[PDB]
């Protein structure tokens, strides 16, 4: 089987700047003078979409800023000026021999200017309380870059257990990221304590932005 | 107009078998080969096999050869793929794709999210998230909606029946205790809330439920 | 150049040369000349199957002029593929040895 290895695993490029992704094959994918390799673009919630075929040929409808090159075992995809909607995962694929194989995938980010997260904290709903559970939610919206860390405290004591985190993919409109963090407790444990604190640490913030509430 | 239609979701037990459909339209079904490809989370795309609908000639990925079966129904212009001895490793999004002979895949199916589980169907709980009674800061207020404890994926969440789409962030689901949880935030100007009405609406087609929740307090 | 987009019609019978190669002469039915001619060889199951081109690079200079192509196909049963898309020309060939 022809193995396709992509490099790098992921990268972030400033809007309007050039991006380059490489794909290397464990052996030749050339067939009668043509490279049987293809470049696809896939966005979250969407099926893949062809960008480049036969190494260098542009599919109709694909913007001219997209281009491809290479032969035998070494190939490259280039976007000479990235845009917001260019944020996606990119895959190379070969069909020179069965079974068809795909590269490991390269994730492209769009490096808008850094932005501190907007932090909002939300106590459990009365409705949830009626069912006997108690989830506290903290939204961290429109920050960049992706790396961020959240710390929970209950009455000044750090809480590690019961924390679940999630991050959105890059926003199609503003190139920002968002994060939701949920600390889940029982109602009984929850009603024993007073102050609850969510702390967001990010590249843009040396001393973290902190949001808290008192249940009573 | 060319269309390759697949069912939105499948819930199958481990070791069991499944049969996924791809209904082609807008072209001569038997004029193009059909391939099948799956996308696993953090594991990329994987090729399963191909079939020529005209002659029923086919080819499998050797990894799947003992486990897979490609068939077609010309009458309905539908291609089928069957896979048995399913495990959790087979949980993925399955796409059918039309082969632009002899090169690339020109048209991709809608995709079928396949879950291999023995879990049972569970309706979501929907909770409104209103701010702290001492948390009303800022020229613009932010509200939220929490959808907890459902199965299987997916759910669809909208705000004001879709009339309100800007300034919204809807977060990816998360498997916990064998159930999914997700959340969504919306940010509006203080002039909008609590002055104007805002409701979270959540449909869960797997349980055939739909639930509206007004944001109070 | 870009790859030819049009359709192909077979102009002559396929012929085996003295030295186990084939000469194929085809007539182009496209509008995008000049363009590069899609050419590939496979088997019955659609599997890409190795071989080599004797002709440098097959190109349609003038859509009204037929192009000759000499190639060394794989041994045994194969399909010569001229063009691309649904109307792609598929011609069966056997090379003993």
Topology-level CATH name of chain C: Immunoglobulin-like
The CATH superfamily name of the largest domain in chain A is Immunoglobulins
Strand pairing plus helix content of chain A: what structural class?
mainly beta
Strand content of chain C: over 45%
Main sheet of chain A, how many strands, which sense, barrel? 7 strands, mixed
How much of the residues of chain A is beta strand, in percent? Answer: over 45%
Secondary-structure-based class of chain C equals: mainly beta
Number of strands of chain A: 21
Series of secondary-structure elements of chain A, N-terminal to C-terminal: EEEEEEEEEEEEEEHEEEEEHEE
Number of strands of chain C: 10
Give the CATH level 1 class of the largest domain in chain A.
Mainly Beta
PDB class: immune system/viral protein
Keywords: structural genomics, antibody fab fragment, Flavivirus, Dengue virus, niaid, National Institute of Allergy and Infectious Diseases, Center for Structural Genomics of Infectious Diseases, csgid, immunoglobulin-like domain, viral envelope protein, virion, immune system, IMMUNE SYSTEM-VIRAL PROTEIN complex
Assembly: trimeric
Entry title: Crystal Structure of DENV1-E111 fab fragment bound to DENV-1 DIII (Western Pacific-74 strain).
């Amino acid at each position: 089987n022809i193995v396709l290895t992509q490099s790098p695993a992921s990268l972030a490029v400033s809007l309007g700047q050039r991006a380059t992704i490489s794909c290397r094959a464990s052996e030749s994918v050339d067939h009668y003078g043509n490279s049987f390799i293809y470049w696809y673009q896939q966005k979250p919630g969407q099926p893949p979409k062809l960008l480049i075929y036969l190494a260098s040929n542009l599919e109709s409808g694909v913007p001219a800023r997209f281009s491809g090159s290479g032969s035998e075992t070494d190939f490259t995809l280039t976007i000479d000026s990235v845009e917001t909607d260019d944020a996606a995962t990119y895959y190379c694929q070969q069909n020179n021999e069965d079974p068809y194989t795909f590269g490991g995938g390269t994730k492209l980010e769009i490096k808008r200017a850094d932005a501190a997260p907007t932090v909002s904290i939300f106590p459990p709903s009365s409705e949830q309380l009626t069912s006997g559970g108690a989830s506290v939610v903290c939204f961290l919206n429109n920050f960049y870059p992706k790396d961020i860390n959240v710390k929970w405290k209950i009455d000044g004591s750090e809480r590690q257990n019961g924390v679940l985190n999630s991050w959105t993919d890059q926003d199609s409109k503003d190139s920002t990221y968002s994060m939701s963090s949920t600390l889940t407790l029982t109602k009984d444990e929850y009603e024993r304590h007073n102050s609850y604190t969510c702390e967001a640490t990010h590249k843009t913030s040396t001393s973290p932005i902190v949001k808290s509430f008192n249940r009573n | 107009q060319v269309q390759l239609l697949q069912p939105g979701a499948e819930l199958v037990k481990p070791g069991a078998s499944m049969k996924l459909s791809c209904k082609a339209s807008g072209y001569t079904f038997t004029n193009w080969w059909m391939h099948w490809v799956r996308l696993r989370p953090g594991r990329g795309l994987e090729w399963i096999g191909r079939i020529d609908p005209n002659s029923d000639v086919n080819k499998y990925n050797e990894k799947f050869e003992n486990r897979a079966s490609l068939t077609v129904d010309k009458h309905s212009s539908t291609a089928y793929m069957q896979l048995s001895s399913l495990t959790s490793e087979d949980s993925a999004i399955y796409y059918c794709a039309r082969w632009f002979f002899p090169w690339y895949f020109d048209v991709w199916g809608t995709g079928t999210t396949v879950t291999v589980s023995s879990a049972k169907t569970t309706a979501p709980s929907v909770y409104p998230l209103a701010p702290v009674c001492g948390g009303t800061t800022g020229s613009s207020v932010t509200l939220g909606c929490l959808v907890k404890g459902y199965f299987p994926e997916p759910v669809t969440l909208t705000w004001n029946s879709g009339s309100l789409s800007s300034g919204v962030h809807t977060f990816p689901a998360l498997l916990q205790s064998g159930l999914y949880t997700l959340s969504s935030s919306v940010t509006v100007t203080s002039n909008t809330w609590p002055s104007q009405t805002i409701t979270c609406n959540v449909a869960h087609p797997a349980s055939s439920t739909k639930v509206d929740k007004k944001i109070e307090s | 150049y870009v790859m030819c987009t049009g359709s192909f019609k077979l102009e002559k019978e396929v012929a085996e040369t003295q030295h186990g190669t084939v000469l194929v002469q085809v007539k182009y039915e496209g509008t995008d000349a000049p363009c590069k001619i899609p050419f590939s060889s496979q088997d019955e199951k659609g599997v890409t199957q190795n071989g080599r081109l004797i002709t440098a690079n097959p190109i349609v200079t003038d859509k009204e002029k037929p192009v000759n192509i000499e190639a060394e196909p794989p041994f045994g049963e194969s399909y010569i593929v001229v063009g691309a898309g649904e109307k792609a020309l598929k011609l069966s060939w056997f090379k003993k040895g």
